[PDB]
Every structure is written in C-alpha cells, then in structure tokens.
Design a protein around this ligand. Sequence first.
Ligand SMILES: O=C1C[C@@H](c2ccc(O)cc2)Oc2cc(O)cc(O)c21
Ligand SMILES: O=C(O)CCC(=O)C(=O)O
Ligand SMILES: [Fe+2]
Length: 348
Amino acid sequence: VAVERVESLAKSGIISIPKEYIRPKEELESINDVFLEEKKEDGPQVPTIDLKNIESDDEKIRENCIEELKKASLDWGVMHLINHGIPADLMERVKKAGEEFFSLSVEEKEKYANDQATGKIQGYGSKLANNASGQLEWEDYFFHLAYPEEKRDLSIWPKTPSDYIEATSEYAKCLRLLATKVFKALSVGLGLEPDRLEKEVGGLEELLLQMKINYYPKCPQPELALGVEAHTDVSALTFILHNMVPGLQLFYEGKWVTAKCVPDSIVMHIGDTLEILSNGKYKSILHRGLVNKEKVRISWAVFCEPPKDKIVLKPLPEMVSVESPAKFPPRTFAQHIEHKLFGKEQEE
Ligand SMILES: O=C1C[C@@H](c2ccc(O)cc2)Oc2cc(O)cc(O)c21
Ligand SMILES: O=C(O)CCC(=O)C(=O)O
Ligand SMILES: [Fe+2]
C-alpha cells in the first residue's frame, strides 16, 4: 500500500492533475471559475439569517426570528448565520490553530494519520476510493470528535499548535449552546414542544459533534476537479467556518449556486437527520466544493449527529398523515449512512 496526500500532489510541480481527480465529462459542464461565479448577484442566492432575537424576551421579535429561520430551512435548508453569539475572537483562534496545523509538513501531519483499515477514523486523512470509479477529490482533512468532552480522544488532537485543543473545545462548547437554540426554534417552527428535536437526536447525553477541517490545496486545473463531491450531510445540523475563500455551492432549483463569503458568519446546514425527523419539511440540500489556482481553501465543519446505533430515526408521528405519509422508513443513523453508500455503489 501507498499513502498519498493532495497537499503533496499540489506541491510536486505538476501542470495537469491526475486522471483520478478529473470529474466525469458530464459533470465538467457545470464546473466554472469559482472567482467569477462569486461575482454574480443574478439569480437565487443563499439566505442570510440574523439570529439576534432567537431567545428575545419580546415574543413579537423572537417569533419574527423563528419565522425567517423556518422559511430558510423549508426552502434552502442552508443559510449564513449572523449574530449567532459565538465570539468573533474565538472563531479566529480556531481558524488560526487549524491554519497552523496544516502548515506543518505532511511528514509531521502523518503522525496523526488516521487508519481506516483498523477502524481509526479520527485523524489526518484523505478520502480513499470506495467504488469502481477511482475518483478522488482535491482535499485533505482532519477529523475528530469534539463534544462532549468525555468522549474525546485528546491523544489524537494536534498538540502543535499549542492553542489547538483549548480553542477547538471552547468553540464546540459554544456550538453546542447554539445548536440547542437552533433546535429549539426549529422545534417551535414545526409546531412541536421546544425540547423535542434535541431529545430525538440524543439530547445533551448522546448527541455528537464531529469536527472536520477540509483542506483544499491550490489546484492547477481547478475547473476539472472538486474539493468535495455533490452530497447531502447526514447530520442533524452542520455548522461551517471558512478562510474567506469561495468554493461552497448549493444545488438549488436545478442549478449550482455559489455561496458568498460573509465575514463573522456561520454557514448552517439542515442535515438528513432533521429532514427525516421532519418528514422532508426541512431540506438537506445537495452541495459541493470547488477548488482554485490562487488560494488555499480551508473550512471547519462541525456535524451535530445522533449516536450511530441507539436511535432508530424516522419521521415524527406529528409529521405524518394519510395526506402526507412517511417519506422515509425507519433507519438507524448507521443504517441511513449505509443505505446512501449502497445506492452510490452502482458504478457499473
Ligand atoms: O458529511 C459528512 C462527512 C463525514 C466524515 C468525513 C471523514 C471521515 O473520516 C469520516 C466521516 O462525517 C459526517 C458526520 C455527520 O454526522 C454528518 C455528515 O454530514 C458528515
Ligand atoms: O468546505 C466546505 O465549505 C464544504 C464542506 C462540506 O460539504 C462537508 O465537509 O461536508
Ligand atoms: Fe457537506
């Protein structure tokens, strides 16, 4: 076996990328210059959602917020969050600590290398081919469980930079509170009791927050490749930071919309797990990630997910009728992931 990193391929002095990184000729049609795509204000754009009044003591103004967030969720299922209560300073500590880890040599990152053949999923990694097409994506990553503190294996966290562990686990901490509030509003928006969605996905007890730093090296032929493939997140909610480089695209009314770079904001996705519980009301949107020649892109995605086995996920009884039956049969989290894999496995 051989290990190989996109970061290495990027610094090897290649003018054309390998065959495995080129998208199918059908998919190449839709890939354009991310920078030009960033300069278009024509057509649908991702909503920006202001969360200032999400817990507001004036019910008139709290309710307002809940409606914008609901509408945003029913429509797009993705949005830029502003005024979300996470310190701007703390967001910078996290990005700085992640930029520093990735600026170590590959050889020093390899010390944290994951090992999927032995079930070591946490760590420094790069996505291996997983069906008959050998397709790879133009990214390396760092993945670990983040919250709750008691479930973390800190021995896989970067010790250099020194501020990595503290920054990340205060961010997670802060993210869990935000998630509680979001779940609260989503719950109300749907008409349920306010605690509901959080306990259906696991509560404080069982809900997991996974951190994945997506590291997109510069790419010499960016318009042939993807950073991350077209997919929906399996999560209940995903929160994303990035280094103000464009690349996120959303598949919205039949076309690929590019996200803009809003400073001090957080991309939040509605994920499959909420879509299932809500019977398709809230949308787990399809999305992907483009690379470029000029700039390293980095994003920090935190996936708030249920326990893999323990909770049988399915549409809520409140959320089904004769007039609108269950759109999804019951599956555990792990089963849901497998059904998706199984589906995609069918190349040939
Ligand atoms: O979209 C993904 C990527 C995935 C993942 C990446 C790397 C790895 O080594 C293992 C898993 O983790 C997740 C976990 C979530 O609940 C929800 C998600 O949507 C995802
Ligand atoms: O890097 C990004 O902005 C996209 C991240 C993404 O879709 C993922 O990590 O699941
Ligand atoms: Fe995603």
